[PDB]
Ligand binder design. Structure first.
Ligand SMILES: [Zn+2]
Ligand SMILES: [Zn+2]
Ligand SMILES: [Zn+2]
Ligand SMILES: [Zn+2]
Ligand SMILES: [Zn+2]
Ligand SMILES: [Zn+2]
Length: 143
């Protein structure tokens, strides 16, 4: 002779349609576990192993869940998977003042104007460090 009440509320989360990492509309297949995650960073985040960003080439759409290969736009809904589409890194991110470095072969965040790439060092460096940073090592006395 007693009436109870139902409980156990729940919440929601955001994943696809562009994650905190990047803004894309297509999940990249995982040739490691045959799974699909917003971005490469997400995979590892929801997995014990790390996924590659170069190996995988195929991609799936989130607008019309249509299958397709590495591209910038869909072939069924023509939904921009990202203003910027890389072929080497196979990454798709919205216009976030980012540029792809050839010397490194990886995507980087600009604005390129306030940035540059050193040879001797073989890496990207911000203008703020134009000279201050060292490239070659030298000096007998240590400490
Ligand atoms: Zn995996
Ligand atoms: Zn992500
Ligand atoms: Zn689509
Ligand atoms: Zn790239
Ligand atoms: Zn670079
Ligand atoms: Zn240097």
């Amino acid at each position: 002779g007693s009436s109870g009440s139902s409980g156990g509320v729940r919440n929601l989360a955001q994943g696809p349609r562009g994650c905190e990492h990047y803004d894309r509309a297509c999940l990249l297949k995982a040739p490691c576990c045959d799974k699909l995650y917003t971005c490469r960073l997400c995979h590892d985040t929801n997995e014990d192993h790390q996924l590659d960003r170069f190996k995988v080439k195929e991609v799936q759409c989130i607008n019309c869940e249509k299958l397709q290969h590495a591209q910038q736009t869909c072939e069924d809904c023509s939904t921009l998977f990202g203003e910027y589409y890389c072929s080497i890194c196979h990454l798709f991110d919205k216009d976030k003042r980012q540029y792809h470095c050839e010397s490194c072969g990886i995507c980087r965040i600009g604005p390129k104007e306030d940035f540059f790439h050193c040879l001797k060092c073989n890496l990207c460096l911000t203008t703020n460090l134009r000279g201050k940073h060292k490239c070659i090592e030298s000096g007998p006395s240590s400490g």
